[PDB]
Amino acid sequence: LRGEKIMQNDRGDVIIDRYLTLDQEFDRKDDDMLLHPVKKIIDLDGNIQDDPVVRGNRPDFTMQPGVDINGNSDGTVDILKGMNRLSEKMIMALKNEY
Amino acid sequence: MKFYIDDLPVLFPYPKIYPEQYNYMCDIKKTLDVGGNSILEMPSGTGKTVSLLSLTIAYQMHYPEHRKIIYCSRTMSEIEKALVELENLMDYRTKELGYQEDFRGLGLTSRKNLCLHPEVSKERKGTVVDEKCRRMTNGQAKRKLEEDPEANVELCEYHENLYNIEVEDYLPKGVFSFEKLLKYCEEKTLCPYFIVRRMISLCNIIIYSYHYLLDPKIAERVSNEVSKDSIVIFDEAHNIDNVCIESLSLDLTTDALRRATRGANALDERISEVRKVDSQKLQDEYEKLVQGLHSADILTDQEEPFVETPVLPQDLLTEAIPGNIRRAEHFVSFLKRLIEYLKTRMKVLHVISETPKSFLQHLKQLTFIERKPLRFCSERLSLLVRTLEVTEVEDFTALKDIATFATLISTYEEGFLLIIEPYEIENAAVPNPIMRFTCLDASIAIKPVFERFSSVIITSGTISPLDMYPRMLNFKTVLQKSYAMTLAKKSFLPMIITKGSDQVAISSRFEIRNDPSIVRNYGSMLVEFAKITPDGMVVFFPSYLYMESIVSMWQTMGILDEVWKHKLILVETPDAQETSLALETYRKACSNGRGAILLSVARGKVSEGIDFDHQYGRTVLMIGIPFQYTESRILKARLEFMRENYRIRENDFLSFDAMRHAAQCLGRVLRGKDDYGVMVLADRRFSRKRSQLPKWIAQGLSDADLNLSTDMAISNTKQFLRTMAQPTDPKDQEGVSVWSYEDLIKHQNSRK
Amino acid sequence: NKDMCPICKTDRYLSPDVKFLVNPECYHRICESCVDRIFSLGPAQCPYKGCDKILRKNKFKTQIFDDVEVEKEVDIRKRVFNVFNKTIDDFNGDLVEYNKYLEEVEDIIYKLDHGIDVAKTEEKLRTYEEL
Amino acid sequence: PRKLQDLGLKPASVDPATIKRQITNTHMTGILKDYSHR
Ligand code: SF4
């Protein structure tokens, strides 16, 4: 929750760790809660979909999310989304029923 | 206002006008009258789109030729902005002229952005959307339904409803933005995608992206409808070379070839099934092929080829099929052994760079495939797929890449290069061979445009130097100049920081990305600027990987904690939708006074059209020069090609490529002359790059700001921000930065 | 079962030096070790369950492509093109005639590969090479 | 282990031979603490 990169070395707590999977479900639920159509003025999705048949050289590894030797994600992208998600939720909470 | 040029009456949609706009408008008119190409660079703080539309639209409405206007942008977002500006002018003209003159203006985009079908518009990729729309609009469903009403094949109500009305009555006279177009079409159950495409020939001004003009896959259909004497405008063309290069590029992977074999086997199985039951279709296609007809003759206007043409229309052979790939089974065997040859070439152990001619010779040796049949591979595959009743083409999708490779490599031999690398990612446990077909000459894709059209206007906010672009792209210009904004009081403070508060040099070089001293200095700079920045602060990083690494280090070091106190942190992400959501949240925070900081990539999706005017953008933090990845096979080959052909030094182009992106981000913070912000370039290497910046940015950069420190820069930022908040004296800007109608007449009289 | 000799079952893991060869006559994969022990003395029946075609050791060659079917197409194509060879100028620029000729040689390869009519095709190849 | 490497088989062991083992003012008798390094 704080944004720290989880370290497998850290033992943690057995009881609290049971909610790690539950927290993952809330993250997906929160993403849908925040997902809504965006104005075409600042709609970045349309820009990449302007030409759906663009065929070109793939970008270098510097322009892609980092990966490790095994090839799976290093996990640094998750914390970026987490902080992004936190800001979105905080702003959304302002526009409440009141 | 309504002022006069030598003979052209132009109606400006504002009561006031900047001196730069009038000079910009005057130069554009001269270019159109004299004919030819021009490169005009104007500051981002002055209205450019409104000035372009005002003069160009007035030009056609007055002169007898009534030349149409072609507006080219780099992204779909800019299309909406231009259309909104386009709507502004026509509304003002209608009010002033007392009537709505006959005028049609539409934007053109993909199906994904204009699909109203409840079931086909819920996809995450445009390729799937196109396939589903084609299935319901190819005409197979309509013909099957007519023969047998019991057929379960469905149709699209939006597409069908268009047949009832005529093309001229699809939309009322006027300008229809994407937001307005969707609303109008939804109320009447019509397809905006088909409305615009069938209506291009009737539009006075048509707006689309560069891909619709440079990429042959989608350019040929649109280019055939537009006129030949129309005015062509290239807006924000400071990165047009990249668009041209990617139009004729391809990448092949082991997975793609593996999937291609599965598709080839499926096609062979399908041909056998069709042969057993319905062999007349094969004979009918074969008979037409023997005659000499091509996809254009056989395919109806309602349907489209399965494989989009990968080469320019002028490079397509006009002769008949060679014969080796005339029959379905023979073509499949021809296609199959080609895939096998590609697979064996991917088992190399070192990077191999070879020209297309050498690749063809080796192919002609190991196998017996000639050059000419390859050029027809894409054309032949589309015909075969069309006649095979392939309603579901999920398996055959992989074969499109193979067909594209064959046609591209067998067509061009100069300006193209093939790279085979055993390691797509050097940091991988197992090799992942990748084959890249690259275009080195950027003028090949834009050559047809500069010849088909007589007058072309190239305009942008940070297109400098203006001499390189004619060098890089083979064209000549009648005039090329850059304007300097005549602002009474300085509104933008460009500064360069070469060291931190500790006086230690700071740079964003990749090899020292994980440096405690450099990372801390940048983090302290980020925190310090967030303390004083009132509303919005945008930070651009050289690459996404650098941003990911440095941000993680900041989190561990606790730097992000201090930033969280004063501003919300929004970070660009690979997912386009998430990044769009971040922008909405970032704008909301700035508007409500909470304050937000946006971390993005200088070469990312945010920098390619998203602007931070007024409160949204008040401070631009350029963390290092956005240099490309030097140790890249694609870049090194292109650098060598330019050096040998255009005599452009490798270092010079690398500096030019990086500076244009840095300036691009700098110019996205000013909209009018009342907008202000601070632009800080944080790297020791920006110190000597002052001459490389745009003229209007270099002018504002003082000598004392060439090399500053974090503490010194912060002090200037605080002083500058305080000064800009004071009420401006009107008399200091009555007729030196903004002109009324009377002031403009004075300028005309004095000049004459 | 994709990296071992079907006969001796010499797995690559325990025998990293194992090298596999193929024979044009039946296009079967056999390791080099089996080739020497069974064919060094002279020609012998192919050591496969359901293959009774005789072959010689000298005819063995390394496989180029990883697909056996394409190998048969290419080698048959090479044999055919060794006899049926012509260029555009041979017909004095008659592209229509050249296109027909290309189909005829292409069709000949198709029939030979799938054995639609082996006797007539092979006899047809035999007569042309003398010309 | 050497023999397996000759045959191309990875040996999961090593040769054991390769393992390497691995003055004034004396009226302040004990007040002075040795702060030799910082
Ligand atoms: S016709 Fe238009 S609305 Fe219907 S599926 Fe195609 S793009 Fe979508």
Ligand SMILES: [Zn+2]
């Ligand atoms: Zn064996």
Ligand SMILES: [Zn+2]
């Ligand atoms: Zn055999």
